[PDB]
Design a protein around this nucleic acid. Structure first.
Length: 116
RNA sequence: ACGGAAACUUAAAACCGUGUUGCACUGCAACCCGGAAUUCUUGCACGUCG
């Protein structure tokens, strides 16, 4: 019952497409004007942990709410039972869940299946 | 032989020690790759029998 930093592994995988975009990036080819969140160095697609926060932040606020019904209008109006993970300016808290970034791991298999 | 003639205001001592430009934040909501074009017009299973 001392200290713990429970690290969570796993592999996310797009089944459909995915168009989490970057607005005005700097890919500069054409109709990449709707780009994806890329890496700047390797230029491989990645996923910000903000979105994986800002989807589980959103889509649990209306699942822990919208049953308690009080609509939780602001990201401090949310109850403790969400924001004690996700963080609040009310209790000044640091969150408790560091949603990390992640980028393209299996680029190698995607050249194995001929994806160009 | 001038209350004269000589003399350093001098020697050392760290403006240092404790301190995150930090915590809450979806690049999101709306759109059919959709509408009009004949696989068609010329064409006989037949010439041939002491």
């Amino acid at each position: 019952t001392g200290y713990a930093k429970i690290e969570i592994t796993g592999t996310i995988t797009v089944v459909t497409g995915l168009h989490i975009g970057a607005g005005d990036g700097f890919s500069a080819i054409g109709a990449v004007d709707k780009p994806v969140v890329r890496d700047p160095l390797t230029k491989w697609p990645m996923i910000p942990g903000t979105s994986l926060k800002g989807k589980v932040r959103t889509l649990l606020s209306r699942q822990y709410g919208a049953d308690t019904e009080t609509f939780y209008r602001k990201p401090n109006d949310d109850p403790a039972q969400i924001r004690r993970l996700f963080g609040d300016t009310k209790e000044y808290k640091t969150g408790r869940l560091v949603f990390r970034d992640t980028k393209l791991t299996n680029k190698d298999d995607l050249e194995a299946r001929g994806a160009k």
